[PDB]
Symmetry: D2
Subunit: 488 residues, 4 copies
């Protein structure tokens, strides 16, 4: 941190005797190469920026804690859940998805809700979105999808034809449950404090006996759901582009700390076999009548970052950062995510990104003899420790009899290249329709959904507009008509 | 380079069977590591972004040409000015300054106007802004200044206290001429087609006989100055963030090509001595009565880029990229800029950034036996050519009798650490005051200037607000009172 | 590519007046910042180096061709094997393993024999070594193993204790077959032209009718096996560190082109289950009596690189670079190599490494709408092509119903974490013992094996020396006694 | 810092329950994407290497201290020299020049002798060689010269034609004093403890009264000069490539700490005007009769690094890293070096290289409000500190009245493009010849000089060999005859 006497130095600690002097011949002659302090400052300035995240480039963050309020040790044996009242420090980063780093907060998008827990068994990242489902169930489709959400390669404008061309392509129409949620007013939250978080995917949690369950996590806001209409969202995007960032910072600064209650839905393997859809399908939700929400604990965000770049922009979240007893299911999208994020951190941040303080596991320090060297190895590189498992040294492997996934499903089959295209019939449209009816219970929302879709589809090509109307007619023909009226 | 048969392959040209298949055990088991096509696509997706420009992160581009319309061979011996009617291919990137890559087009900022001319004597970059002057005359002050134009290190919000604290600091108040232009409606142009371009700095151009002149360039728009008020600009920022990108793209696409007339002011070393201010000062403009504009040619932008990332985002512009007979003056800001841009390019784009097609000197091929190797050397690396000047090989050095700068000023003095702080008295406030006089001729512009400053200053804390009033009071006391009325 | 008028320019094509002039005040005053040509040259000089390969940092290369001399279309349906007499251009890079970039050629090590074939179905990389087997059959062991082959973390010296401590650790002693080949005089070849290349792993090749075979490839030298003794190799290591590079360059320059004959061993799925060891085990060779060598073609290297950095150092070889009908087996080491190489290339060379000319698939151009952007995208980035599969555009997917691996083995089981430690009994020592008997037919090679191990083991401390004697006594008690005699 | 319980974890602190297990279907089925611990280890392994130094890639290092033993406060006011007996911790890296990272210790080259001093006024780097002079006096000549010292661009072999073609080119022949030293037995030291260090360049040191002197520094070995013959050096280069690394490590390990006595030669500006050559010429030494060695203190190296990579390989040394009262002279080579090293560090190590522990100014902490962000900013990035000089915050600028270089020379002249080619006459050959006579005092050294040049020149082209003989005849015709006799 900052030296107490507050002496301004260059990079190598040499004192600067005047803040702005630059050497030249005389008072107004040519600048000299020997002014190394000028080059030191200008060259570090040129290197301030790292690549923005792809996607979720634009975001906000805050520190807090998770607290266990109820017993779930019969579902999960992770140390962070072992005792009621046990707190684990965390870091949450909220974000949008398609926009670049300087884009506005109040636009229509999913919001990310990524939390990092510093547990005794290492860091745990719950890399969640604010929606129960997502647009795809094929991992290979993700580069293609995010490209259509961003800017046209030539015009560099957000293109409504790309957007809707992808989503109305028959094999991609399984995105419809998610398109409904996006274009409802929940696609434009009032702020980060008044939205939910969801695992989306099914995960597998195990207790210490070896009993395991399929789980889905719900992080419900205690401040309550509050949204903006698209007209309010568009006005605020122009007057204050940093509206949600300002709201989170000011709420924590004023002591009005936001909290969320964490719940899980559990299901056994036998129950999963009896469902009309797959537990490995990201575009489906589990019925809360049959599978109710069991309470686990709370997330309170009570501390602002001191430095946004160092603590939030450099923060790295990955679903592969998991503790014992919490594992990923065979959901194809989650499976690919176990590779993608840590790979992105090695590019965006660097080979030794886990040594950056917010990414460092302080409650369970990194120690691995064979993970050494790399650029910007700053923690000492374990000194003279052998670079392999030397026989005259001692090493501890805890929980040796704990299973990773041996005790779970038995798989059978060849290596099949599979494209989980939109199924024949109505199975991938049922839940979008049930959601349309749930919006009928809330006044003004079915009308708003049609308006939100309509003013966006208006920009599209007439051939693509018709495919949008047909796709939505398969959900509800009344909804399809209402979209067309707004679009024309 | 799209192959005619349009066979979709992976990175190493191996054909893909089906666009979205990913390997797993059975149809719904875990994903397999042997699916190298999935990893190839996801890993390249993670590496799509390069760091944004610091500053001028957000921008638009277009190709076109320069045409000589008048003879100025008496002033400058560069090959691009030799014949009347001579055309040189160019690339122009327009941009804002403080905002990040995804920020809006219609915000208050200077606009960049950087053109790359592909001449027979290598490339030439006229890295200009849309304003006659700039905020600083000390190069060391630029990291500090851009930081106050961006976001607060903790809150990540754009902060009016930082902004006005830097500009009202006594030794930085020489920024006042530029603050005046910034907060006029010229600070929010209607589009890139209806704004000017200016050298800012004094350059030194010389003819083939060895005679030289201090030169300042003026790129005037043929569509005429058209501005927006701040209420209009703020509505469009939320409504269409890419308003000026859309405007430039559509204008060229419809055949309504934007053009600009290029003009220069010239001056002798003797005339520079009879001047009230220094020719090396960026915050000063040369009076057009004494030094009239002399026409040179035209810039017509008539071609959109095919790929924005490859051709506009990877474009690299530098003051140090200059042709024979065009050199930099001893302006300290320009002197440091001869270092900064190429240095920024090596980091942002890479050591061999000049091998990227838009940055390549196609009309004067790069050849240098000692500039070899480096990451991503893709043009052959001159094959087996000696890595030095081998005596059994031939090397041509053209224009050996042409002087660079030894035929110009003679300097005398020691190496002095100098800070060109705001002069005591009125010399650095005179031109801001006469700029206020010129705005009195245009109806409603002085009222708009005071409004634009007043609504911005309104967000600052009382102490800094008072310093802003005193600074503007020194230009005109009526202006200061008018800003204070809007801020209250 | 060199411009024929041979005018020396800087990076941006601007002509240099005099090769070595640098600007200063007067003739002997301080250097000026405005000399951008000096900084262009020095800054590019600073960026010449890329990270060396980890491992195989030190090596040599040459271009040539593969020619089909026999019909093996019943085994493999790849286009490169379709006609007898068909030629495919290739690039081979030979190398050592443990040593850094500046290390000597004639040291004891495996040699790499990596070939890239530019086929009509994309590039094919045969990333082979000069030994039939390898040290490990667990991919997780690879970081640990290369670490012990290199330098001690503190002393930075090659350490005989690390080396033998890893290899004599009980669960790693499956390395013994490879330790035997390494310490024979085959571990110090006379040159790259007089050594063999081997697949190591089993691969799965299939014909156009969907029939497949387990295959192992043998690339036999037509120049004949020639080796150095360790005393000769050590004397040449000091005398000429680049002995093998010089030999390959001069042999091709003098027209004495080296060639190798390619043979395959095939096996069906039924034959594999009758074997006393696993086809997925890298430390095992297939008996030639039961599985004879079948000839395929010839590799002839006949053209030297014009530029070593651009063509050999920037070359990228990966097992995952494979053409249709050639796939990897479930060998765990090969499975991890399917990820490792392409990942290393994205770091070492960069995101768009496949755009570097020698890595470019020229006979089957790279085209994929979703693999876009990234630093140093120099081939145009497909221009205005959509960044997804646009419905108003056309895309060809060839060999749509050709299987990748569905037509092969059916896997069954849970996700088991497995460590394939040295098996009980004699099974992992048998082939090491029969290799010792084969060296008994070639006079002097058994004494040399004992000597080569003895002088290396002598540098280890007595506890580790005893474990080495014990491990080799398990092969042959006579061998063990002879190693002990030389080491003491 | 290794965790006390020695629990092996992955990068994010999650405990590994078995060191080598990798997940697959069944016990011998294909590998799963799900095994993030395998990819964590393999991907970090792929990123262990950073680019080697260019030049001086191969080296060794150790920690120790500098102790003041004599008063020089009348010459230099730097705090590290202020009291007799004052110790300052240091780090020294010794190295060769042209060879790559794996190259041998006992080759013919200059040796580097770079020392970093952790003083109370920041770090100080004395980046010296083990020779009084160097090959060039023009900075632009440096990329060309190092290219000829390394490998041929095509053959990758060290080429005697490149080597001698550059040196015998008439305008480069000022290298002859250095070539004489290089090819004597001083060109192959017995070890790093048996050689001297020299500033090479003239520096300017000032006392607190403003009085200044031109200074040259001599770091004389207390162990005495001890050399190898080229036959001994070539034998050890094959037998033990890490001979000097082993020597330095074991000497410190066994308590036989190497020490050097530091001396300086001082000179006023008036004496500089009376000299027959320039104080700014690197190829000239100052006579010790007239300018005797004045004693300053001692450098003792008494501590080995714990980890070579983190402490020696990541160490960054730069002439621009200097404390108050020590400045560079207008020597054109030193002037360019003020840019080159810190620039190379930004590439090779990263933008925040100064945050790596060995480069950190621990006795005078880095604090600068405007040097922020950048990849791998691990020290907290000064938290919420303003990114500029905020007026409500406090900043200390010490030694405000201490001059940097104003008090020294007054320069006159235009910006001249100058190439300091070999001067006419004998002025650039005189000192090479008196060095030959000093070699005559030692028995066998003039025969060895002729032999060392002869066996190297032998490998060159006949017309280049003739030019070598003509250049050495200009020093001594008997020397030239002896070189010709060995080369044949
Ligand atoms: C196959 C599909 C997906 C892939 C390949 C993928 C990939 C990525 C990548 C590479 C990033 C940027 C990471 C970084 O640079 O630090 C990202 C961020 C993010 N993704 Fe995904 N993602 C996918 C699906 C999803 C889904 C379904 C969710 C929600 C359950 C999700 C939630 C997030 C969040 C919250 C972030 C931002 C984390 C932060 O604040 O830094 N992603 N994703
Ligand atoms: C000491 C002051 C200045 C410094 C150090 C400086 C530095 C920079 C840097 C490093 C960039 C980004 C370069 C890149 O990554 O390609 C930039 C961009 C730019 N600067 Fe400056 N600048 C300064 C003053 C100015 C002034 C006075 C002008 C106008 C005459 C100017 C006009 C521009 C423009 C137009 C761009 C955008 C170029 C593009 O479109 O890519 N700069 N500047």
């Amino acid at each position: 941190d900052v030296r107490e006497d507050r002496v301004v130095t260059n990079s190598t600690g040499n004192p600067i005797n005047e803040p702005f002097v630059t050497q030249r011949i005389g008072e107004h002659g040519p600048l000299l190469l020997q002014d190394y302090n000028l080059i030191d400052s200008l060259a570090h300035f040129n290197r301030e920026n790292i690549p923005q995240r792809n996607p979720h480039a634009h975001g906000s963050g805050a520190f807090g804690y998770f607290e266990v309020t109820d017993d779930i040790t019969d579902i999960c044996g992770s140390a962070m859940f072992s005792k009621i009242g046990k707190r684990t420090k965390c870091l949450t980063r909220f974000s949008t998805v398609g926009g670049d780093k300087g884009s506005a907060d109040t636009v229509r998008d999913p919001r990310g809700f990524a939390t990092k827990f510093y547990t005794e068994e290492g860091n745990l990242d719950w890399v969640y979105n604010n929606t129960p489902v997502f647009f795809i169930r094929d991992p290979s489709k993700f580069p293609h999808f995010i490209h259509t959400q961003k800017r046209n390669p030539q015009t560099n404008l957000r293109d409504a034809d790309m957007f809707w061309d992808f989503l109305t392509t028959p094999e991609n129409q399984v995105a419809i449950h998610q398109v409904m949620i996006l274009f409802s007013d929940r696609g434009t939250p009032a702020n980060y404090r008044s939205m939910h978080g969801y695992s989306g995917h099914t995960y597998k949690w195990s207790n210490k006996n070896g009993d395991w369950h399929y789980v889905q996590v719900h992080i419900k806001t205690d401040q309550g759901i509050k949204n903006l209409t698209i007209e309010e969202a568009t006005k605020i995007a122009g007057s204050n582009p940093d509206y949600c960032q300002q709201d989170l910072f000011e709420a924590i600064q004023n002591g009005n700390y936001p909290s969320w209650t964490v719940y899980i839905q559990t299901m056994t393997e036998r129950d999963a076999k009896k469902l009309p859809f797959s537990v490995f399908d990201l575009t489906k939700v589990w019925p809360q009548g049959q599978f109710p929400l069991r309470r686990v604990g709370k997330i309170v965000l009570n501390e602002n970052p001191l430095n946004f770049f160092a603590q939030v922009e450099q923060a790295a979240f990955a679903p592969s950062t998991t503790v014992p007893y919490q594992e990923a299911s065979a959901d194809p999208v989650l499976q690919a995510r176990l590779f993608s994020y840590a790979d992105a951190h090695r590019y965006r941040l660097g080979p030794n990104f886990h040594q950056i303080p917010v990414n460092c596991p302080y409650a369970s320090k990194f120690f691995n003899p064979a993970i050494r060297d790399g650029p910007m190895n700053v923690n000492g590189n374990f000194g003279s420790e052998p670079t392999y498992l030397a026989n005259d040294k001692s090493y501890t492997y805890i929980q040796q009899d704990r299973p990773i996934q041996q005790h779970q499903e038995v798989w059978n089959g060849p290596a099949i290249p599979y494209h989980w295209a939109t199924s024949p019939g109505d199975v991938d449209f049922v839940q979008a329709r049930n959601l349309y009816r749930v919006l009928g219970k809330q006044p003004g929302q079915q009308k708003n959904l049609a308006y939100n879709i309509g003013i966006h589809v208006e920009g599209a090509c007439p051939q693509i507009q018709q495919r949008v109307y047909d796709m939505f007619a398969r959900v509800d023909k009344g909804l399809s008509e209402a979209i067309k009226k707004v679009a024309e």
